[PDB]
C-alpha cells in the first residue's frame, strides 16, 4: 500500500517536472489576475468621513426673509461635524450671527419702546393745528434725545454703513448680499453674475426662479382663486418698489424744505440735544449724508428689483399647448414649472418641470446603496435648487387657504436627518460579487490539467494495466488526489498572501482564510475528478472541463442577483455546488470584514448577520460537497461493468510442467447473447512458447484477460501454479508478467526509471533493481537510447519496451498479447531474439494473431475459434492431419502426364492440382509415408530432371495455413454526378449523428429567442410615469413627532390631525391614555444608563467610530447609545409613530441609525430603511416679538401720518401690519427628511400640508371630502432628450446584437470540425483519388454549406417574427434582416477553412475558433458602440470614422448593420409622436448597403484563399535500373525515374536515384523499412504535396500534364480507417461508384459485387463503428480495387487480422490480377507478397538491394534446404553426427529441447533422396519421434529474415 502510493506520487510529480512551462504558467496566471485586482484596489483607496449634520432649509411658507436666507446661504449644503443650532428642540432659525436677523431684532427691540415718544409728537401736532386755526418743544427734544441715543447704541448699523460705503469692484453684488446674510441695469446685473464662477453657479440655481413661469392649465374660477392666492408671495414681494417711489415723493420734497431754509429748522432745534442732532459742518454729518445714503440705497434696491417678472403666473387652456409653451420657454430659458389642476371636493395637483430640474420618478429607492447621507446639491438634491418644493409648498398653502376658510401661519423648515461617521469604499462593497469570479477565472485553467491528465491516463488504457497488475483503484484515486492538491494548495497560499499583503482583505489572520481556500481547493479538485469521469476522449474532455466548470459558477450570479427573494433552505440546497458554496462563504467573509473585524478565530462559529452563512458553516459544507462528489465518482465508475467506457488434442511433452493449468472457463458479456468464451481444458508448460491463435477479439484477448488479474473468475477453474485468482492473488504477481495489445508505456517518462518503476512495484527492492535494470536495457539493445533519455522521440521501437517490461521480475509465467502488430520487420527479429533469449525456464503465452511465426517460436500451438478450442499440439504431423500432405513444384525459367506416370510407377498415390506455365504443382499424399519410396522416386527424378527441361524443384510439407483453414470450420454530367455523390454522402454523414446536430442547431437558434424573450428585465427607456406623493408609498416605516412648548390648543389640534393622517385611528380617551405602548428596556443596559449621569436630554454615552488602523462602516455601540427605547404605537397601515419629545434628537438618530439598516445591510441592493421622515411641531421662536406695540405704532402712523385716499402709502402700511402681527408665527413645523429615499422631502411636505388641512377643519363629511394629493410628472421630451430617450440608453438592442453573433458563431464551426476530421483522417486522400479536382471538390461542398446554412436562418427569422418585435415584423425591416443574414452566411463560410490546415484536433479547433470569433465579435460590437456613443472629443470621432469605413470583419458589419437598422426603428418610434415625416427605409445603400457589398465582395476572396494555399503544388537492381534508364516500357503501366525525395528539414534524400518499371499483368511486392521513403513515394504519385523533381508516370499519362488523370487509375488503401462511422459498407461502395461516373443501372451491381466479393452480406447495413479492424481494412481494399484502376494501391493493408479473411482477400485480388490489373503492396508482414504475387523488391534506407524475380533472388541468396526433427531423449548430437556426415553442411540453429532445425548447402543439383531412405534407417538408429523436411519452400527466406 504505502510503497505504491509514494511511487505513484513520484510518477505524477515527474510529469510536471518534465513539462515545466504548463506548471510555470499555472503559477503565474492567478498571480497576474490578482495583481490586476490589487491594482484595482490601489486605484480606489478607502475614504472616511466625520459625523455629518446639515443646516436648516426654510420654505417660503415660513415668511420671506428666512426663505431667501436659506437659499442664498445654504446653497452648498456643507456638512457640519458639530451640531447646527437648527436641530436643537428650542431654536428654529440658526442665524443669530447674521446681520439681517440682527437688523430685524434690533428694529423690533428699539422700535418697541418708542410708543409714547411719537404719539406725544402726534398729539402736539394736533393741538398745534388746533391752536393755529412751551412744554411740547422740550418734551420732543428729550424724546428725540432718547430715540437718538437708542438708535446710536446699535453696532449693526455701523457694520452695514461700512459695508454699503464700499466700492462695487472685485466681489460683486452677491458677495455683498451674502456678507450680511450669512433694461440695461438688468444686463449689468447679469454680467456681474456671469463675471465670477461662484455668482454664475448661484444664478444657475436662481434663473428658473426669476425668469420662470407658472402655467396652470384649467381656467375655472376655482383655479383662478388658487392662483390669486398663490401669487400673494409674488405680487406683494416687490412692494419695496412702491416704497421706492415713496422716496420719490418724500426724499426730494423734504429736501426742498431743507436747503437754504434753516430758519424754519433752527427755532425748534435750538429752544446735549444739539450734539446728538449733529448740527452740520465739516465733521458733523446728519442730513446731507442721510439723504444721499438713503437715496443711494433705495436706488440700489430698486435697480436690484428691476427685472423680476412681476407676473410669472400665466395661463394656457390646453395641456398640449402647455407642453408646447414649456418647450418654447425652455428653448429661450424662461420656464420654471407647470401646475396642472387635473381633477376628477378633493384636489389633485400635477407638477411638470424639466428632467434637469426634477429627480427621475421611475423608481423610489436607489439600486446600489451608497453608505452615506447622500447630500451633494448637484447630484441628488433636485427638489431644492431646481425649485420643486418651493412651488409645491406655495400651491399647497394656497390650496389649504382657499379650502379651509382661514389663514394658517404654519411655516415649514426642511431638515436632513444627520448621518453617523461612515467610510465609503466601493471595492469592499463589491468583493462579494468579484472574488468568487476572479478565483474561478484564476482556476479555470488549473482544473483543465486535472481532467486532461486523468482522462489521458484513462484513454491510453494504461490505468487498466496498472489496475490489473497489482494496484487498487483506491490507491489510484489517493495518488491522483494527493498529487493534484499540490498546485491548488500552492496557488491558494500565494493567493492568500496576495490578499493579505495587498490590503484587499486587511485586519484578517491569514490562517483562517487559507483554511477557507484549502476547503475550496479540496472541493474543486474532486469536482474536477467527477467531471473527468464522464468522458473517454483526452482533448475533448480537456476543452469541455473549463466550460462545464464555469457554467456552474453562474448559479452564484443568479443567486446574488435575486438574493432577497429566496429563503435560507433554498440557499443551503443550491450551495451543494462547489463555486456557489465558495460564493456565499466569500459574501460572509466580506460582510464580516465589513464590521471592521477581519476573519479571525474569535468569530468563526457565529453568523455575522441573521441570513448569511458563517465561515465554519461553509468550510464544513465544502467538505460535504467534496464527499458527495467522491461518492458520485465511486458510483459512476460502475457505468462501465467489466469493460471500458473435436477432441483431437494431445497434452504429453517429455517435460511436463503445468504452471498455468486452466479448465473450462465460462464468461458472459451482458450485451452479447452468446457467451464470451466456451470451455477449454488445456494446460501450458514452462520451457515452451505455446502459441494461441484465434479470431479478432473472439478468444485472442478474453482468455488472456481472465487468466490475468483483471477479470474475476465467477465461472471456470484457473489455478495458476496450484492456486486460483479467487483465493491468493498475492504471491503469483512476482512470478507473473503481462503485456497486452496496446503499449504500456508512459509518454513523458524515460526508460531507465521506467524499468525501475515497474521493478519497484513488482516487489523487487531498490538494492536489486539495478542488476536487473542494466541487463534489461541491454537485452532490448537500448544502451545507446537510455542516456539520451527519450520516450516520445522513438516510435515503433517501443513495442520492444512493451515486452521487456513483462520480464522485469524474472517472472516464471509471461503472458503476451499480439506483440508483433505495429512493429517494423527490422525489429520483428529483435523481439523474436528477445523471446528466444528468454524462452528457457519460463512459461510463455504468445497469442499472436499471425501464422508466420508460430512455426518458429511455438513449441506447441493451440487454435481457438469463437471461444471453442479446435485443436492443440506441436505443428508436426501429429496435428498436420491433412490429406494433401506434401506439394511438389517443378519450376521452369515439359509434359504433365509423363511425369505423372513416372510418379505412378514409383508411388501410385499422387494428385496433380496445378499445371500453370513455368510451375507444375503435384500433391503427394501422406498416405503411404514411406521415406524409402520417396527416395527411390527422387533418384529417378534426379536422373531425369536435367533432361526434363525444368532445371528446378522444390517440395513443401503441409503449411499451418491450410490446416488452420481446415480446422476453422469444424468449430458536365460527370461533374454533376460528382456533386450528387458529394451532397448525398454529406447528407448521410449528417443524418445519423442525431444529438450532435440537435445540439449544434437547436441551441443557438433557440438561444437567441430565449435570450430576447427573457431579457426584458432591462427597463424600457422613454417617458416617465406620474407618481403619487405620500409617505404611504414607502411601505411600513417609522416616524416621530417630537413637540416643543405644547401650551396651545392649536398645536394640539395640529398634532391630532398629524396622528390621524399617520394611519392611526383616533381612539377613545380611556384607550388613548395608553394609546402608545412603550417597549421593554434592557435591564443590564438600564443599569448602564443609571450608572452614567443620564437624563433624556443628556447625550448618548459613546459609539466606537473607525479607529486609525481599524476602519468600520457604521460605528459600533450597544443599546446604551441612542438612549432608552422611546414610546411607540402601531397603526393600521403598518406605520409606527414614536413620541420623541424632549430628547437631543440628533444624538439619538445618529446613534440609533445603523441598527435599522442592519436588517437590509445583507445584500445592499434595495435597502428598505424604516426611518424616512419625521416631524417636530416647534413652538415659539425664542425671542421677544414686541410686534403688538409695533402693530399699534404702524396703525397709529396709518391713521396719523398722511393717510392717502388712494392708498399708495396706506396699502404699504397695512401690509406692514401683517408683516409685524404675523411675525409672531404662532406655530411652526419642521420636516425631518431622509435623502436615501428619493422622494421623502416632498412627500412629507404634502403630508404636513394635508395635516394642516385636517387641523383647520370642522367635523363632518368635509374632513374626508377635503383632501389634496399632489403628483409629480415631468415633460414629455425636449430636443436633445429625443436622442436621450431613443439612442443613448440602447441596452436591449446591443445585447441582442452581440447575442446573435454569440450564438451564430457556434453554427459554422460544426463545418470546421467536420472538415478537419476529414483532414486528419485520410478520407480527403481517397476523395482526391478520381476525377475530383480539388477545385471541383470545393465547388461540390460549398453548395452543401449553403444547404445546411438554410437550416438555422429560417428558425431565427421566424422566431424574430413570432415575438412581435417592432423592428422585425413590419415588411420594411424584415427583408433587410433576411438579406443581411443570408449574405452574412454567404460570407462567413469561406474564411474558416485554412485554420484546419494549421490545426490538429477538432475539439481544439472548435474552442480556438469560437474563442477568436467571440472575441472579435464582442470587440467589434461593444467597443465600437461605446466609442461612437457618449463622445468625448474630435480624436475619438476621427478614430471612429476610420473604424466604420474599414469594415473588414464580417461580424463587425453584421453588428453595425443590425444596430443601424434597430436605431432607425428606434428613431422612427421616437418620431411618431412629433413631426416625423419619417419614411425611414432601412435598406439604404449608405446605411446598410456597404455591409452587404463588403460581404458579397469579400466572400470570393476567402473562397479562393483556401484554394491558393491548397494548390501550392503547381545484379537485378542494375538489370532493372539500366533497362528503365536506357528504355521506357510503354507496355508497363507505371514508370518511375529519379525517385528522389527532398525532405524539408531532414536535409537528406530518402532514395538515392533509383528507377522502376511495373508491368500490368503482375503484382509488384514492395517492402520498405522506416526511413526508406515509402509513404512519400505513395504521396507524390498520389500528388498531395509539391511535384518539383522526379519522373513518375502511370499508364502512359503524366502527373505534370494532368493531375486528375493520375488519380483515375490509382486506387489507394491506407492503414488509416478513412471511413465514416455514420455510414455503412455498401454506402461507401455506392458513393465511390457515383464518384467514378458509374451509370445508375450499374451502381447497384457494382456495389453488390464489391460487398459480396469480400463477404459483407451480414455487414451490409451494419454501421462502420460496430466492425472489426479486419473488416474495415478489407472493405478499404475492396473500395481501393473498385472503380477499375490500372494499379491498386494498398499501403500497409495488413495489421493483425484473421487469416481466413486473408484467404478470401488474396483469393479475390488474385482473381483481379488474373483479370489483368496491377496491385501495389507495402506492409510489415511480407508473407502476403509471396502468397499472391510474382515479384519481390526490398529497400532499406532508400537503397534497392534485390529488385528482381523472387526465385532468382532465392537462387542468389536464399532457398536453402532445411529439416525439422523430433527426438524424445533430446540428444541432438547423435542425430547431427550422421546428418552432417551425410551432408557437407554442418550449421546449427535453435539447438533447444523442443525440436531442431538443420540447413544444408543451397542449390543442390542432386535430389534429397540421399537422406530420405537413409532417414528410413537412421531415424530408427536412435530414439526419434518424427521428422518433417523443410526443404525449399518460399517461406525459407523469412528464416533469412530471421538471421540477418
Swiss-Prot record:
Name of the protein in question: Phospholipid-transporting ATPase ABCA7
GO molecular function, a single term: phospholipid transporter activity
Q: What PANTHER family does the record point to?
A: ABC TRANSPORTER DOMAIN-CONTAINING PROTEIN-RELATED (PTHR19229:SF250), ATP-BINDING CASSETTE TRANSPORTER SUBFAMILY A ABCA (PTHR19229)
Associated disorder: Alzheimer disease 9: A familial, late-onset form of Alzheimer disease. Alzheimer disease is a neurodegenerative disorder characterized by progressive dementia, loss of cognitive abilities, and deposition of fibrillar amyloid proteins as intraneuronal neurofibrillary tangles, extracellular amyloid plaques and vascular amyloid deposits. The major constituents of these plaques are neurotoxic amyloid-beta protein 40 and amyloid-beta protein 42, that are produced by the proteolysis of the transmembrane APP protein.
Quote the record's binding site residues for ATP 2. Answer: 1568-1575
Q: How is its activity regulated?
A: ATPase activity is decreased by cholesterol and ceramide. ATPase activity is stimulated by phosphatidylserine, phosphatidylcholine and sphingomyelin, but phosphatidylserine is more effective.
List residues traversing the bilayer.
20-40, 435-455, 478-498, 511-531, 540-560, 572-592, 612-632, 702-722, 1001-1021, 1296-1316, 1342-1362, 1379-1399, 1407-1427, 1441-1461, 1487-1507
| Residue ranges of every copy of the ABC transporter domain listed in the record | 660-891, 1534-1766
What is this protein's function? Catalyzes the translocation of specific phospholipids from the cytoplasmic to the extracellular/lumenal leaflet of membrane coupled to the hydrolysis of ATP. Transports preferentially phosphatidylserine over phosphatidylcholine. Plays a role in lipid homeostasis and macrophage-mediated phagocytosis. Binds APOA1 and may function in apolipoprotein-mediated phospholipid efflux from cells. May also mediate cholesterol efflux. May regulate cellular ceramide homeostasis during keratinocyte differentiation.
Query: What induces it, per record?
Result: Up-regulated in macrophages upon cholesterol uptake and inversely regulated upon cholesterol deloading from the cells (at protein level). Up-regulated in keratinocytes during terminal differentiation.
Q: Output the CDD domains linked to this UniProt entry.
A: ABC_subfamily_A
Q: Does the keyword Nucleotide-binding apply?
A: yes
Which residues get glycosylated? Answer: 231
Keyword set, alphabetical order? Alzheimer disease, Amyloidosis, ATP-binding, Cell membrane, Cell projection, Cytoplasm, Disulfide bond, Endoplasmic reticulum, Endosome, Glycoprotein, Golgi apparatus, Lipid transport, Membrane, Neurodegeneration, Nucleotide-binding, Phagocytosis, Repeat, Translocase, Transmembrane, Transmembrane helix, Transport
Amino acid at each position: 500500500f504505502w510503497t505504491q502510493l509514494m511511487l505513484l506520487l513520484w510518477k505524477n510529480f515527474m510529469y510536471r517536472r518534465r513539462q515545466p512551462v504548463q506548471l510555470l504558467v499555472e503559477l503565474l496566471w492567478p498571480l497576474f489576475l490578482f495583481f490586476i485586482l490589487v491594482a484595482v484596489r490601489h486605484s480606489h483607496p478607502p475614504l472616511e468621513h466625520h459625523e455629518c449634520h446639515f443646516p436648516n432649509k426654510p420654505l417660503p411658507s415660513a415668511g420671506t426673509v428666512p426663505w431667501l436666507q436659506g437659499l442664498i446661504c445654504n446653497v452648498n449644503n456643507t456638512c457640519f461635524p458639530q451640531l447646527t443650532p437648527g436641530e436643537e428642540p428650542g431654536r428654529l432659525s440658526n442665524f443669530n450671527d447674521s446681520l439681517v436677523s440682527r437688523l430685524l431684532a434690533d428694529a423690533r427691540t428699539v422700535l418697541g419702546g418708542a410708543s409714547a415718544h411719537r404719539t406725544l409728537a402726534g398729539l402736539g401736532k394736533l393741538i398745534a393745528t388746533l391752536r393755529a386755526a412751551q412744554e411740547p418743544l422740550h418734551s420732543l427734544l428729550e424724546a428725540a434725545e432718547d430715540l437718538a441715543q437708542e438708535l446710536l447704541a446699535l453696532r449693526s448699523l455701523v457694520e452695514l454703513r461700512a459695508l454699503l460705503q464700499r466700492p462695487r469692484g472685485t466681489s460683486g453684488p452677491l458677495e455683498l448680499l451674502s456678507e450680511a446674510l450669512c433694461s440695461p441695469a438688468c444686463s449689468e446685473l447679469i454680467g456681474a453674475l456671469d463675471s465670477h464662477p461662484l455668482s454664475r453657479l448661484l444664478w444657475r440655481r436662481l434663473k428658473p426662479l426669476i425668469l420662470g413661469k407658472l402655467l396652470f392649465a384649467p381656467d375655472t374660477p376655482f383655479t383662478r382663486k388658487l392662483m390669486a392666492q398663490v401669487n400673494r408671495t409674488f405680487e406683494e414681494l416687490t412692494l419695496l418698489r412702491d416704497v421706492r417711489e415713496v422716496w420719490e415723493m418724500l426724499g426730494p420734497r423734504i429736501f426742498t424744505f431743507m436747503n437754504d431754509s434753516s430758519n424754519v429748522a433752527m427755532l425748534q432745534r435750538l429752544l446735549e440735544a444739539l450734539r446728538s442732532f449733529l448740527d452740520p459742518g465739516s465733521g458733523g454729518y446728519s442730513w446731507q449724508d442721510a439723504h444721499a445714503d438713503v437715496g443711494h440705497l433705495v436706488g440700489t434696491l430698486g435697480r436690484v428689483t428691476e427685472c423680476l417678472s412681476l407676473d410669472k403666473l400665466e395661463a394656457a387652456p390646453s395641456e398640449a399647448a402647455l407642453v408646447s409653451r414649456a418647450l418654447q420657454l425652455l428653448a429661450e430659458h424662461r420656464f420654471w414649472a407647470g401646475v396642472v389642476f387635473l381633477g376628477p371636493g378633493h384636489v389633485r395637483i400635477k407638477i411638470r418641470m424639466d428632467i434637469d430640474v426634477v429627480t427621475r420618478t421611475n423608481k423610489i429607492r436607489d439600486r446600489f446603496w451608497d453608505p452615506g447621507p447622500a447630500a451633494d446639491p448637484l447630484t441628488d438634491l433636485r427638489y431644492v435648487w431646481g425649485g420643486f418644493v418651493y412651488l409645491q409648498d406655495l400651491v399647497e398653502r394656497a390650496a389649504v387657504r382657499v379650502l379651509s376658510g382661514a389663514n394658517p401661519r404654519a411655516g415649514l423648515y426642511l431638515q436632513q436627518m444627520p448621518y453617523p461617521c461612515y467610510v465609503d469604499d466601493v471595492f469592499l462593497r463589491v468583493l462579494s460579487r468579484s472574488l468568487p469570479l476572479f478565483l474561478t477565472l484564476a482556476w479555470i485553467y488549473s482544473v483543465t490539467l486535472t481532467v486532461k491528465a486523468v482522462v489521458r491516463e484513462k484513454e491510453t488504457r494504461l490505468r487498466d494495466t496498472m489496475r490489473a497488475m497489482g494496484l487498487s483503484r483506491a490507491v489510484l484515486w489517493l495518488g491522483w488526489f494527493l498529487s493534484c492538491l499540490g498546485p491548488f494548495l500552492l496557488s491558494a497560499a500565494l493567493l492568500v498572501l496576495v490578499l493579505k499583503l495587498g490590503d484587499i482583505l486587511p485586519y484578517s489572520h491569514p490562517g483562517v482564510v487559507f483554511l477557507f481556500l484549502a476547503a475550496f481547493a479540496v472541493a474543486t479538485v474532486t469536482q474536477s475528478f467527477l467531471l473527468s469521469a464522464f468522458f473517454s476522449r483526452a482533448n475533448l474532455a480537456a476543452a469541455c472541463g473549463g466550460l462545464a466548470y464555469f457554467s456552474l459558477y453562474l448559479p452564484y450570479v443568479l443567486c446574488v442577483a435575486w438574493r432577497d427573494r429566496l429563503p435560507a433552505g433554498g440557499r443551503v440546497a443550491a450551495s451543494l455546488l462547489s463555486p456557489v458554496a465558495f460564493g456565499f462563504g466569500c459574501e460572509s467573509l466580506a460582510l464580516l470584514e465589513e464590521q471592521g473585524e477581519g476573519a479571525q478565530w474569535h468569530n468563526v462559529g457565529t453568523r455575522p448577520t441573521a441570513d448569511v452563512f458563517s465561515l465554519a458553516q461553509v468550510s464544513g459544507l465544502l467538505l460535504l460537497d467534496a464527499a458527495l462528489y467522491g461518492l458520485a465518482t465511486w458510483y459512476l465508475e460502475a457505468v462501465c461493468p467489466g469493460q471500458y467506457g473435436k477432441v483431437l488434442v494431445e497434452e504429453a511433452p517429455p517435460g511436463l510442467s503445468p504452471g498455468v493449468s486452466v479448465r473450462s472457463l465460462e464468461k458472459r458479456f451482458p450485451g452479447s447473447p452468446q457467451p464470451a468464451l466456451r470451455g477449454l481444458s488445456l494446460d501450458f508448460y514452462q520451457g515452451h512458447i505455446t502459441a494461441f491463435l484465434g479470431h479478432n477479439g473472439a478468444g485472442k484477448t478474453t482468455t488472456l484477460s481472465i487468466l490475468s488479474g483483471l477479470f474475476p473468475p465467477s465461472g471456470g477453474s484457473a489455478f495458476i501454479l496450484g492456486h486460483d485468482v479467487r483465493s491468493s492473488m498475492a504471491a503469483i504477481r512476482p512470478h507473473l508478467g503481462v503485456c497486452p495489445q496496446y503499449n504500456v508505456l508512459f509518454d513523458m517518462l524515460t526508460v531507465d526509471e521506467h524499468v525501475w518503476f515497474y521493478g519497484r512495484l513488482k516487489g523487487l527492492s531498490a538494492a536489486v533493481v539495478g542488476p536487473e535494470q542494466d541487463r534489461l536495457l541491454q537485452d532490448v539493445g537500448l544502451v545507446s537510447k537510455q542516456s539520451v533519455q527519450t520516450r516520445h522521440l522513438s516510435g515503433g521501437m517501443q513495442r520492444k519496451l512493451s515486452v521487456a517490461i513483462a520480464f522485469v521480475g524474472g517472472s516464471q509465467v509471461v503472458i503476451l498479447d499480439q506483440p508483433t502488430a505495429g512493429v517494423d520487420p527490422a525489429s520483428r527479429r529483435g523481439i523474436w531474439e528477445l523471446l528466444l533469449k528468454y524462452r528457457e525456464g519460463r512459461t510463455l503465452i504468445l497469442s499472436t494473431h499471425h501464422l508466420d511465426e508460430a512455426e518458429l517460436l511455438g513449441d506447441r500451438v493451440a487454435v481457438v475459434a469463437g471461444g471453442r478450442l479446435c485443436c492443440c499440439g506441436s505443428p508436426l504431423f501429429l496435428r498436420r492431419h491433412l490429406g494433401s500432405g506434401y506439394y511438389l513444384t517443378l519450376v521452369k525459367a515439359v509434359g504433365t502426364p509423363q511425369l505423372l506416370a513416372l510418379v505412378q510407377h514409383w508411388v501410385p498415390g499422387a494428385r496433380l492440382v496445378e499445371e500453370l506455365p513455368h510451375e507444375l504443382v503435384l500433391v503427394l499424399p501422406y498416405t503411404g509415408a514411406h521415406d524409402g519410396s520417396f527416395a527411390t522416386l527422387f533418384r529417378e527424378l534426379d536422373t531425369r530432371l536435367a533432361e526434363l527441361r525444368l532445371t528446378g524443384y522444390g517440395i513443401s510439407d503441409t503449411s499451418l495455413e491450410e490446416i488452420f483453414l481446415k480446422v476453422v470450420e469444424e468449430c458536365w454530367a460527370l461533374t454533376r454526378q460528382q456533386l450528387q455523390a458529394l451532397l448525398l454522402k454529406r447528407f448521410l454523414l449528417a443524418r445519423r449523428s442525431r444529438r450532435g446536430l440537435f445540439a449544434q442547431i437547436v441551441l443557438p437558434a433557440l438561444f437567441v429567442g430565449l435570450a430576447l424573450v427573457f431579457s426584458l428585465i432591462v427597463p424600457p427607456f422613454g417617458h416617465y410615469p406620474a407618481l403619487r406623493l405620500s409617505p404611504t408609498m414607502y411601505g411600513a416605516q417609522v416616524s416621530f413627532f417630537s413637540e416643543d412648548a405644547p401650551g396651545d390648543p392649536g398645536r394640539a389640534r395640529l398634532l391630532e390631525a398629524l396622528l390621524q393622517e399617520a394611519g392611526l385611528e383616533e381612539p377613545p380617551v380611556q384607550h388613548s391614555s395608553h394609546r402608545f405602548s412603550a417597549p421593554e428596556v434592557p435591564a443590564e443596559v438600564a443599569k448602564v444608563l443609571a450608572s452614567g449621569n443620564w437624563t433624556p436630554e443628556s447625550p448618548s454615552p459613546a459609539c466606537q467610530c473607525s479607529r486609525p488602523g481599524a476602519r468600520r462602516l457604521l460605528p459600533d455601540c450597544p443599546a446604551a447609545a441612542g438612549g432608552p427605547p422611546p414610546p411607540q404605537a402601531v397603526t393600521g397601515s403598518g406605520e409606527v409613530v414614536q413620541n420623541l419629545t424632549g430628547r437631543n434628537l440628533s444624538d439619538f438618530l445618529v446613534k440609533t441609525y445603523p441598527r435599522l439598516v442592519r436588517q437590509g445591510l445583507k445584500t445592499k441592493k434595495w435597502v428598505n430603511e424604516v426611518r424616512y421622515g419625521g416631524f417636530s411641531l416647534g413652538g415659539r421662536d425664542p425671542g421677544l416679538p414686541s410686534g403688538q406695540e409695533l402693530g399699534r405704532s404702524v396703525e397709529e402712523l396709518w391713521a396719523l401720518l398722511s393717510p392717502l385716499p388712494g392708498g399708495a402709502l396706506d396699502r404699504v402700511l397695512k401690509n406692514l401690519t401683517a408683516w409685524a402681527h404675523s411675525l409672531d408665527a404662532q406655530d411652526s413645523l419642521k420636516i425631518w427628511f431622509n435623502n436615501k429615499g428619493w422622494h421623502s422631502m416632498v412627500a412629507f411636505v404634502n403630508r404636513a400640508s394635508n395635516a394642516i388641512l385636517r387641523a383647520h377643519l370642522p367635523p363632518g363629511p368635509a374632513r374626508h371630502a377635503h383632501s389634496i394629493t399632489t403628483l409629480n410628472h415631468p415633460l414629455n421630451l425636449t430636443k436633445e432628450q429625443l436622442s436621450e430617450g431613443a439612442l443613448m440608453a440602447s441596452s436591449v438592442d446591443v445585447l441582442v446584437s452581440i447575442c446573435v453573433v454569440f450564438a451564430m458563431s457556434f453554427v459554422p464551426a460544426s463545418f470546421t470540425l467536420v472538415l478537419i476530421e476529414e483532414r486528419v483522417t485520410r478520407a480527403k486522400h481517397l476523395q482526391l483519388m478520381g476525377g475530383l479536382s480539388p477545385t471541383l471538390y470545393w465547388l461540390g461542398n460549398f453548395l452543401w454549406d449553403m444547404c445546411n446554412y438554410l437550416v438555422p436562418a429560417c428558425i431565427v427569422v421566424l422566431i424574430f417574427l413570432a415575438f412581435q418585435q417592432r423592428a422585425y415584423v413590419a415588411p420594411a425591416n424584415l427583408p433587410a434582416l433576411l438579406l443581411l443574414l443570408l449574405l452574412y452566411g454567404w460570407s462567413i463560410t469561406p474564411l474558416m477553412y485554412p485554420a484546419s490546415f494549421f490545426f490538429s484536433v477538432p475539439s481544439t479547433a472548435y474552442v480556438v475558433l469560437t474563442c477568436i470569433n467571440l472575441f472579435i465579435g464582442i470587440n467589434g460590437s461593444m467597443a465600437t458602440f461605446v466609442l461612437e456613443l457618449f463622445s468625448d472629443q474630435k480624436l475619438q470621432e476621427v478614430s471612429r470614422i476610420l473604424k466604420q469605413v474599414f469594415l473588414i470583419f464580417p461580424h463587425f458589419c453584421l453588428g453595425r448593420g443590425l444596430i443601424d437598422m434597430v436605431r432607425n426603428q428606434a428613431m422612427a418610434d421616437a418620431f411618431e409622436r412629433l413631426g416625423d415625416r419619417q419614411f425611414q427605409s432601412p435598406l439604404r445603400w449608405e446605411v446598410v448597403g456597404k455591409n452587404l457589398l463588403a460581404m458579397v465582395i469579400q466572400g470570393p476572396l476567402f473562397l479562393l484563399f483556401t484554394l491558393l494555399l491548397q494548390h501550392r503544388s503547381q545484379e537485378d537492381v542494375a538489370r532493372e535500373r539500366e533497362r528503365v534508364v536506357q528504355g521506357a516500357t510503354q507496355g508497363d503501366v507505371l514508370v518511375l525515374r529519379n525517385l528522389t525525395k527532398v525532405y524539408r528539414g531532414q536535409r537528406m534524400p530518402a532514395v538515392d536515384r533509383l528507377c522502376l518499371g511495373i508491368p500490368p499483368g503482375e503484382c509488384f511486392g514492395l517492402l520498405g523499412v522506416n526511413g526508406a521513403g515509402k509513404t512519400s513515394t505513395f504521396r507524390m504519385v498520389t500528388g498531395d504535396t509539391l511535384a518539383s523533381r522526379g519522373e513518375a508516370v502511370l499508364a502512359g499519362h503524366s502527373v505534370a500534364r494532368e493531375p486528375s488523370a493520375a488519380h483515375l487509375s490509382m486506387g489507394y488503401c491506407p492503414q488509416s480507417d478513412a471511413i465514416f462511422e455514420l455510414l455503412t459498407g455498401r454506402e461507401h461502395l455506392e458513393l465511390l461508384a457515383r464518384l467514378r461516373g458509374v451509370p445508375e443501372a450499374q451502381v447497384a451491381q457494382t456495389a453488390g459485387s464489391g460487398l459480396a466479393r469480400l463477404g459483407l452480406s451480414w455487414y451490409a447495413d451494419r454501421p462502420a463503428g460496430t466492425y472489426s479492424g479486419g473488416n474495415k481494412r478489407k472493405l478499404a481494399t475492396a473500395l481501393a480495387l473498385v472503380g477499375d484502376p490500372a494499379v491498386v494501391f494498398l499501403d500497409q493493408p495488413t495489421t493483425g487480422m484473421d487469416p481466413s479473411a486473408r484467404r478470401f482477400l488474396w483469393n479475390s485480388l488474385l482473381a483481379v490480377v488474373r483479370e489483368g490489373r496491377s496491385v501495389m503492396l507495402t506492409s510489415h508482414s511480407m508473407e502476403e507478397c509471396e502468397a499472391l504475387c510474382s515479384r519481390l523488391a526490398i529497400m532499406v534506407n532508400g537503397r534497392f538491394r534485390c529488385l528482381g524475380s523472387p526465385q532468382h533472388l532465392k537462387g542468389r541468396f536464399a532457398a536453402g534446404h532445411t529439416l525439422t526433427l523430433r527426438v524424445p531423449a533430446a540428444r541432438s548430437q547423435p542425430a547431427a553426427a550422421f546428418v552432417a556426415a551425410e551432408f557437407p553442411g554442418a550449421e546449427l540453429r535453435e539447438a533447444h529441447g523442443g525440436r531442431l532445425r538443420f540447413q544444408l548447402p543451397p542449390g543442390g543439383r542432386c535430389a534429397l533422396a540421399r537422406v530420405f531412405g537413409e532417414l528410413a534407417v537412421h531415424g530408427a538408429e536412435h530414439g526419434v519421434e518424427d521428422f518433417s523436411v523443410s526443404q525449399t519452400m518460399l517461406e525459407e527466406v523469412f528464416l533469412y529474415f530471421s538471421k540477418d
